Design a protein around this nucleic acid. Structure first.
Lengths: 223, 223
DNA sequence: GCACGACG
DNA sequence: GTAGC
DNA sequence: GCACGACG
DNA sequence: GTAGC
């Protein structure tokens, strides 16, 4: 699948942060009105300290059937630094993206989108490159303040940056910690919550797209 | 400082779990009545995948002045497995312990004590070896259920194993996640809470013993 | 001076 | 490595 | 089939 | 690798 190479990936931490502060201006927090048909999930595993494996899974909604799966193993040199996940995993994901045949209506990533220090988490960043609605679903908080939602089944609260709502915290499963949902590109807080709620089945904490992707990332890491 | 070698460390995961299920019977959850004078904190860092660095710091209470610091760098072969932290970091800590001159009244460890699947976290386990009151202060939950305390300054709640109280969750700092406190050996839930509350200064999330230890663990990892 | 995805 | 106190 | 300390 | 569903 095609995408737009907006800049170089091999950059020192300081120049990468500048690239984020510039790219954040291109983000469009538009509503996603309607029922998607093709939903993609993306996950990464690391077979070695410098070898990652990116997996992209495309599911049919609302049946949740698997329509396509592609992957790419490659050298990963950029160190993990909070706030710069895109410069570590972005390149390999795009490499897998190049192989994808189905054009997703929305892509869900592991990690933040809008709920990022410079308003541009991996989900937002990748959204600008692929020019398709994106959502960031994180298992932990990177930025923003919030009031822990109660332990219900769909109980939730907004994630804030002072006064601005940058996403939401959702208790997708009772007995499990909530997940952090923020819009990426061509998406908004309200739509991301609706969609993620719709992508997560009862008994599950993680939405099917990224949940299935993570499984394949682990399976392929062996056989 | 002396200690009791209760068993072999080089054991396969399955035999190590049996050793825990047997050692749990030796645990004494007795009250710690009185003001301690010498309080120790223990932390570990890893200069290499198979090289750890254990640091033990002894502080004078209530002045919190540093009375002694010792350390030990050594080969670490046991992999990190939730529930078996003692078989990874225990050996190197004991190696540092051998160097310690001051006999602490209580030792605080990073990780669980009683709040463990088999009722024997690193803090409890090390307590049996050194035969001195121990407390496990964790930055995250390993076992047990609890109700998130409010975001006050000393707000707290009990950590449970069904009906049994195995420790407590304390909001040592506003804006920070709470810490998980469980008694090790020669300690009880009530005493551990009292002591840890007393070892943690305003503005801090982590108790001075382990906080200072962690700092030295990082400093020595360089210079 | 004092918060932050993937061995198993 | 970035970052608000 | 479906939760769990230390690059920086 | 352990572990309750």
């Amino acid at each position: 699948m095609d995408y737009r190479q907006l800049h170089r990936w091999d950059l020192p931490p300081e120049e990468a942060i500048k690239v984020q502060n510039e790219l954040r201006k291109k983000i469009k927090l538009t509503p996603y009105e309607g029922e998607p048909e093709y939903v993609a999930g993306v996950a990464l595993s690391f077979p070695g300290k410098e070898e990652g494996l990116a997996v992209i899974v495309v599911l049919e909604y609302p049946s949740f059937k698997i329509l396509e799966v592609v992957s790419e193993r490659g050298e990963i040199t950029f160190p993990y630094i909070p706030g710069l996940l895109a410069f570590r995993e972005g390149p390999l994901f795009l490499k897998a993206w190049e192989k994808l045949r189905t054009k997703p209506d929305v892509v869900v990533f592991d990690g933040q989108g809008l709920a990022h220090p410079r308003k541009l988490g991996i989900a937002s960043h990748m959204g600008l490159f692929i020019e398709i609605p994106t959502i960031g679903v994180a298992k932990s908080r990177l930025y923003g303040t919030f009031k822990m939602p109660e332990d219900k089944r769909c109980s939730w609260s907004y994630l804030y940056d002072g006064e601005e709502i940058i996403g939401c915290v959702i208790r997708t499963k009772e007995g499990s910690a909530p997940i952090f949902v923020s819009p990426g590109h061509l998406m908004d807080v309200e739509s991301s919550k609706r969609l993620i709620k719709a992508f997560t089945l009862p008994g599950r904490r993680i939405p099917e797209p990224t949940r299935l992707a993570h499984i394949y990332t682990q399976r392929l890491k062996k056989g």
